[PDB]
Design a binder for this molecule. Structure first.
Ligand code: SF4
Ligand SMILES: [Zn+2]
Ligand SMILES: [Zn+2]
Lengths: 444, 434, 98, 488
């Protein structure tokens, strides 16, 4: 009877809630489909294309994974800080040692300054666990699963008193070929569901989006699931009179069509909350055939997460709330003045995975077999789009434009989306010339 | 049956559901376990044999209906089934033999069914090289072929087709001068050609069961295949039947009677025990106990049965409840099953919990010693010549088969009409017959 | 090692109570007391298991070097065993690996 | 040896082979001598015989000996012991009675156990009491029957008394040694001791710290809270009025656990069996148990899906809950397709009508179960340990993950894959009319209803609830058994 009432009576409409880069007017606009638009899917073997290989795991392999995880990073962290040799987490000694391991809590609760523990690697400490003493550590940022190199003293071999916590090391950023500097400015929109009010099935915001897509004629519109929110009240009590599979095609249409004039490439990103799709991270692309030869040049389906190249501009793509997770379980030495987020995100660029925090949020199934091949970062992203139930924002970090457009929708009220403007400048100088020149988070 | 004769050579590259993978084996075995029985109770040249044999070959769906070039229903069943059941029977050199034994008794039957003609085509095609000779070369060299042949009576070189093979492949026969040789070629009939097939078939099969083990370590790791590797003949039957639920209406004062004409050896012993001695060891209160529900006892009755049968043993009416009521109530009812509701299979009673002095459970045909058994069976009034067969069996280890032989005699028939593998079952047939 | 091999109780002293026993002669002499005993047990227990001997002979059949054989690591002993052999048999052998 | 100076992996395997080989060869032989082989391992072979006459057993051992050594030239089997009682719990883990012969007929009964250590020191007295109590009758010489009957006996009473209050208050005092200060314990709310310790400190004088041992029991607050959060101190128990002892807990989470670990192996006794012996706790108790544990023992349908969850769906019109456990409902004549009428008598709607919602809920009920299986919940096998952790250790045993609490127990998946694969197959068969009919005897009872209810539409309707699952099991939960991989 009322549905979306409050949503559509919104007055903040169009309001810019944050900017970044170089101030821009309100006249954001790209050339539509004009010129060359090079959308190349990147990562490890082309980031998965089919449904899967399975949905049955062999403990004997998850193990193998988690170990490589640590070994690999380690192997390279060891080459960077040039340490000479890690020490078994079980071998005692009076002199200071450099262990290798992954944090982890000692119980089922919230990791904390007391309960931290390090579980070494197989290759050196054949998986031994030794709790950690931090009293003697100045600056530290820890989270369960955090591959870490620590130096401290373990004399009894039943406790290590940390003395130093090496700083995480990220991957080099993408090396632009000469061709990528010859591309012109592009403007990427970006938005993530829910795409409807939690009290209606109107998808109103969806539409508003569309319109907005049109008006501004963006070059690329990367849209993050959930299209059909597994959590939307009506959906979980199965009151809908339509089959999920459909409903979803429905919206998929409205949007492909609703924006045929725009000339904007559409890049969809699946979500674990999309009731109709494979509840397994990493997820496979979406599935749809209803596409004219026309729309096939305009839409593209990609996994979750992903490393996509928008004009030699390496974007990072993940639908999972990696930030409201990592951040729910992280410990630090400072609270006075430090940027919680800028930190969590910092680990992300150094951990080299799209979800290092392990074990993973209580409701977020993962198949590590796949996770080893399809959820690693290729190179430090030039831009990172990390949606989240956490307030909007955009922080430059370790040379990466980390952007969280917030939710297009939030409960009964208006959300936001955001846009970026790109163009890789002149070849030489002090290297890092952020191809992402500006961005804006806007209500809708 | 048709182009259904196949040298299980070259491995299946398909893939199946753990439901087909598991059913192909249970079944593929049921067959091979029926090739075993028939060869024990009959002979390799009888209709009953040929009949029932192809009958199951039939019922298990392993020779029948066609289809579009690729997917030939039975063709497929038999191909996989065999290979899959190569895993299981590759281990014990006592299974490898038994397998080969029964998978060769099978190629034999699928050959005993084809006419001197269809078997010919299958060879030309099969491995690679074999040739038939026209009636020209056939009769031209006829006399010389019959001279080289065995004690082969008469001068009759029948219509029975004759083949020309490389002298080398017929070593087994020219070495004894049992075939005609010419410019490096041997001439033999069907009988002998076949035996050579079967011969090279065993040797190759064995060879493989060998290379099946070697690479077995790379799967024993898998959880879905433990029930095959380890249990295709444990407590769990070729494919038992009689489980729980089911119906029937038994009065009590009749069991005694049924004891003579219905239950098999095993239970017969137990009732007497419980009636004579007014009690029964642990091992026993279970074999019979269950079996009784399976024939259809009621919760009420079971208690009744034992209780009053434990009070003649001069026990404390209250101590029963306190000590036996409990277990007995469980049995019938709820969870914690697989050994508290699963009326013992025969293969079970035969391979677990043998009995000691004081115990009267287990299978007689298996567990009781020759003489004693002899003494037992005579009380049942089984023809002394009859008893002569049974024990001949018991000596072979075909334990229930014997039970079968006993079914027939106590019931008067030439063939019970089914292959036994569980007491209650043997209980029911004895009831169908009434 | 002592309750089993030597069939006798052997109390222990936690690094916690140490200091507090330096506060009075008696106690200090207990700490000392115990300390010894142990080193004795370490002797005894070494005796019960005819260790050193065992070791000799082993090391004499192998033809290696006593210490090693005491440290631990079966591979070594044998390693040698054969080493010697093959050596006596005009056989070139496996360069050690690393 | 991987890192030897004289390595040559082949030479080894070869040997290992002959090894495992020469073992069966032997195992068969024994069975071939109509003697039951109760265990084996690399070069050993336990053999139940049934003699009381030891003079006969060796004469027998040796008989074996001969035959076996007669076959080879060097290798040889050797007599090696005799047990006068044996409790084979599991791999390389047994309890038994060893024989040491005195002279000419008599001997000695030495108690030898291993792999039977309990780590947690927090088992109340009544447990340890009742615990040993059994372990003894078990190393008693009396008969299996005699042992167990007494064990039933005793236990039976345990309970009774437990209910009439004949058990000393202290006999329930559990005791744990904190290794963190109350506000540092994560699992907080769920750990009994740290709870009392917490109550205590913040409440009065003396404060608990590291190394200190704490005392607590479990009571009935009328708070319904999780057991964990219902931990009180012995003191505050007797001196308070409104609370009472929680018989339930101990009986179930204390006594049984122990006894169990020891009796599960006993043929004839089973988890539940004990549990009932201790009270009217059947149902819920079995619940406490597993689905898996029994994976030592092809099946039938009724039982293959017993443990799986019945599909439920409320009627989009009257609201009442509909329960679908199969294609049909009822027996013989009045057998209607469960999807025909709403369990609600006064409702007149045909669920078949709402094929969409059904196809929905299922989907939802199936995300649920795929998530669970995916949650990862690993649980220690040792009943006295039972550490529930989502963290897969890199420290592996031969069987699997190495429990990190008690360093001697493996973690076993809480919701197995097979436990799942069967919950989907259950949904699949609740709507496979196709097969629920070819399951009927006469082609008449068949047609009768095939024509009375299963109109091609209805059939389609079903093919849909069925295509629901199919897709799932399609490329998913390896229902697929790539034969190519298996032999290639
Ligand atoms: S073998 Fe099977 S049938 Fe023959 S007695 Fe034993 S149980 Fe009854
Ligand atoms: Zn209704
Ligand atoms: Zn454990």
């Amino acid at each position: 009877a009322t549905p979306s009432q409050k949503y559509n009576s919104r007055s903040n409409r169009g309001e810019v809630v944050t900017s970044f880069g170089l101030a821009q007017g309100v006249s954001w606009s790209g050339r539509g489909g004009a010129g060359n638009i090079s959308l190349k899917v990147l990562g490890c073997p082309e980031a998965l294309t089919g449904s899967y290989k399975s949905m049955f795991q062999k403990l004997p392999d998850i193990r193998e994974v988690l170990t490589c995880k640590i070994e690999e990073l380690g192997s390279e962290l060891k080459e960077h800080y040039k340490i000479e040799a890690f020490t078994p987490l079980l071998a005692p000694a009076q002199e200071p040692v450099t262990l290798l391991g992954q944090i982890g809590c000692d119980s089922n609760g919230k990791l904390n300054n007391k309960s931290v523990i390090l579980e070494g690697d197989r290759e050196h400490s054949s998986g031994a666990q030794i709790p950690v003493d931090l009293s003697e550590l100045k600056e530290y940022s820890l989270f369960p699963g955090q591959v870490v190199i620590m130096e401290g003293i373990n004399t009894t071999g039943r406790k290590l008193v940390a003395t130093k916590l090496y700083e995480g090391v990220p991957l080099p950023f993408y090396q632009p070929t000469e061709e990528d500097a010859d591309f012109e400015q592009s403007m990427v929109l970006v938005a993530c569901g829910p795409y409807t009010t939690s009290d209606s099935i109107t998808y109103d915001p969806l539409l508003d989006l569309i319109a907005v897509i049109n008006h501004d004629r963006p070059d690329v519109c990367i849209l993050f699931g959930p299209f059909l929110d597994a959590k939307h009240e009506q959906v979980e009590n199965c009151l809908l009179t339509s089959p999920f599979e459909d409903i979803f095609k429905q919206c998929l249409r409205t949007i492909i069509e609703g924006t045929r004039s725009s000339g904007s490439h559409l890049v969809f990103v699946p979500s674990l909350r999309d009731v109709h799709h494979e509840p397994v991270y990493p997820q496979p692309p979406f599935s749809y055939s209803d596409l004219s030869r026309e729309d096939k040049k305009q839409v593209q389906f990609v996994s979750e997460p992903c490393s996509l190249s928008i004009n030699g501009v390496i974007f990072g793509l993940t639908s999972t709330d990696l930030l409201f997770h990592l951040g729910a379980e992280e410990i630090s030495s400072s609270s006075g003045t430090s940027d919680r987020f800028s930190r969590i995100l910092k680990h992300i660029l150094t951990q080299r995975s799209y979800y290092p925090l392990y074990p993973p949020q209580e409701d977020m199934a993962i198949d590590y077999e796949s996770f080893y091949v399809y959820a690693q970062l290729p190179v430090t992203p030039d831009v990172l789009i990390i949606p989240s139930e956490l307030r909007y924002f955009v922080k430059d970090v370790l040379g990466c434009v980390c952007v969280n457009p917030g939710r297009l929708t939030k409960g009964q009220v208006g959300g936001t989306f955001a846009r970026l403007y790109l163009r890789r400048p002149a070849a030489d100088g002090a290297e890092r010339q952020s191809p992402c020149i500006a961005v804006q988070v806007v209500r809708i | 049956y048709p182009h259904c004769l196949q040298f299980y050579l070259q491995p299946p590259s398909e893939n199946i559901s753990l439901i087909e993978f598991e059913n192909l084996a249970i079944d593929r075995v049921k067959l091979l376990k029926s090739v075993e029985n028939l060869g024990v109770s009959y002979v390799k040249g009888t209709e009953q044999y040929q009949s029932k044999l192809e009958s199951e070959l039939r019922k298990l769906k392993f020779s029948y209906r066609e289809n579009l070039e690729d997917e030939y229903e039975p063709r497929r069943r038999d191909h996989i089934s065999h290979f899959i059941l190569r895993l299981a029977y590759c281990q014990s050199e006592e299974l490898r033999r038994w397998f080969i034994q029964q998978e060769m008794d099978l190629l034999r039957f699928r050959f005993s069914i084809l006419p001197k003609d269809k078997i010919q085509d299958f060879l030309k095609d099969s491995q690679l090289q074999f040739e038939a000779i026209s009636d020209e070369e056939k009769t031209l060299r006829e006399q010389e072929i019959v001279a080289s042949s065995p004690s082969l009576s008469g001068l009759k070189l029948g219509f029975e087709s004759i083949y020309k093979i490389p002298f080398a492949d017929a070593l087994d026969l020219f070495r004894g001068r049992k075939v005609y040789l010419e410019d490096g070629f041997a001439y033999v009939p069907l009988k002998d050609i076949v035996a050579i097939i079967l011969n090279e078939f065993r040797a190759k099969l064995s060879k493989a069961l060998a290379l099946t083990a070697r690479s077995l370590p790379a799967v024993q790791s898998d959880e879905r295949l433990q029930p095959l590797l380890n249990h295709l003949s444990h407590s769990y039957t070729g494919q038992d039947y009689s489980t729980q639920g089911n119906v029937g209406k038994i009065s009590l004062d009749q069991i005694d009677l049924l004891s003579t004409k219905s239950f098999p050896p095993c239970m017969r012993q137990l009732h007497k025990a419980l009636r004579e001695n007014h009690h029964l060891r642990h091992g026993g209160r279970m074999q019979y106990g269950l079996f009784l529900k399976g024939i259809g006892l009621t919760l009420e009755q079971a208690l009744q049965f034992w209780k009053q049968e434990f009070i003649k043993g001069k026990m404390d009416p209250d101590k029963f409840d306190k000590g036996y009521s409990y277990n007995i109530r469980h049995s019938f009812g709820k969870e914690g099953k697989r050994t508290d509701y699963t009326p013992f299979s025969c293969l079970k009673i035969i391979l677990s919990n043998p009995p000691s002095q004081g115990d009267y459970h287990g299978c007689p045909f298996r567990h009781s010693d020759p003489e004693l058994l002899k003494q037992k069976l005579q009380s049942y009034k089984i023809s002394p010549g009859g008893i002569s067969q049974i024990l001949d069996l018991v000596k072979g280890t075909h334990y229930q088969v014997a039970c079968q032989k006993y079914f027939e005699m106590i019931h008067n028939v030439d063939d019970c009409g089914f292959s036994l593998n569980h007491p209650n079952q043997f209980f029911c047939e004895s009831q169908r017959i009434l | 090692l002592v309750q089993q091999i030597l069939k006798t109780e052997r109390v222990v002293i936690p690094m916690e109570n140490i200091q507090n026993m330096y506060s009075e002669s008696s106690q200090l002499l207990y700490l000392l007391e115990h300390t010894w005993k142990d080193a004795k047990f370490i002797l005894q227990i070494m005796c019960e298991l005819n260790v050193l001997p065992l070791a000799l002979q082993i090391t004499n059949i192998a033809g290696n070097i006593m210490s090693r054989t005491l440290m631990g690591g079966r591979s070594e002993r044998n390693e040698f065993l054969l080493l010697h052999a093959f050596y006596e048999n005009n056989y070139i052998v496996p360069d050690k690996q690393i | 040896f991987s890192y030897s100076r004289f390595y040559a992996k082949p030479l080894a395997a070869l040997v290992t082979y002959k090894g495992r080989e020469i073992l069966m060869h032997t195992k068969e032989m024994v069975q071939k001598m109509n003697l039951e082989v109760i265990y084996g391992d690399t070069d050993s072979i336990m053999i139940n015989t049934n003699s009381t006459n030891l003079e006969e057993v060796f004469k027998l051992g040796n008989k074996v000996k001969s035959e076996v050594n007669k076959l080879y030239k060097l290798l040889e089997i050797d007599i090696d012991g005799v047990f006068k009682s044996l409790l084979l719990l599991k791999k390389k883990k047994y309890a038994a009675l060893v024989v040491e012969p005195t002279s000419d007929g008599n001997y000695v009964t030495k108690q030898e156990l291993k792999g039977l250590d309990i780590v947690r020191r927090d088992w109340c007295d009544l447990a340890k009491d009742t615990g040993n109590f059994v372990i003894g009758q078990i190393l008693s010489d009396q008969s299996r029957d005699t042992i167990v009957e007494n064990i039933q006996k005793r236990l039976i009473e345990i309970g009774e008394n437990v209910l009439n209050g004949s058990v000393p208050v202290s006999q329930f005092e559990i005791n744990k040694a904190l290794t963190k200060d109350p506000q540092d314990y994560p699992d907080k709310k769920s750990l009994p001791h740290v709870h009392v310790a917490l109550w205590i400190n913040s409440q009065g004088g003396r404060k608990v710290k590291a190394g200190d041992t704490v005392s607590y029991v479990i009571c009935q607050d009328g708070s319904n809270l999780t057991a964990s959060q219902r931990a009180y101190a012995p003191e505050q128990l007797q001196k308070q009025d409104n609370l009472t002892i929680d018989t339930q807990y101990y009986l179930a989470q204390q006594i049984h656990p122990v006894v169990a670990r020891i009796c599960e192996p006993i043929d004839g006794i089973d988890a539940v069996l004990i549990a009932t012996w201790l009270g009217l706790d059947p149902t819920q108790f079995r619940v406490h148990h597993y689905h898996k544990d029994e994976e030592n023992d092809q099946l039938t349908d009724e039982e293959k899906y017993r443990d799986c969850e019945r599909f439920k769906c409320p009627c989009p019109t009257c609201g009442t809950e509909n329960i679908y456990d199969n294609v049909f409902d009822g027996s013989g004549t009045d057998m209607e397709p469960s999807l025909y009428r709403c369990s609600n008598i006064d409702c007149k709607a045909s669920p078949l009508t709402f094929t969409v919602q059904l196809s929905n809920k299922l989907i939802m009920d199936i995300r649920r179960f795929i998530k669970k299986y995916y949650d990862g919940w690993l649980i220690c096998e040792e009943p006295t340990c039972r550490n529930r952790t989502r963290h897969l250790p890199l420290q592996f045993s031969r069987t699997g993950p190495l429990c990190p609490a008690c360093m001697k127990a493996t973690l076993q998946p809480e919701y197995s894959d097979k436990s799942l694969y069967t919950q989907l197959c259950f949904y699949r068969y609740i709507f496979d009319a196709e097969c629920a009919l070819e399951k009927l005897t006469t082609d008449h009872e068949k047609d009768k209803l095939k024509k009375q209810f299963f109109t091609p539409k209805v059939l389609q309707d079903y093919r849909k609830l069925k295509n629901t699952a199919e897709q799932f099991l399609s490329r998913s939960g390896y229902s697929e058994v790539n034969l190519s991989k298996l032999f290639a």
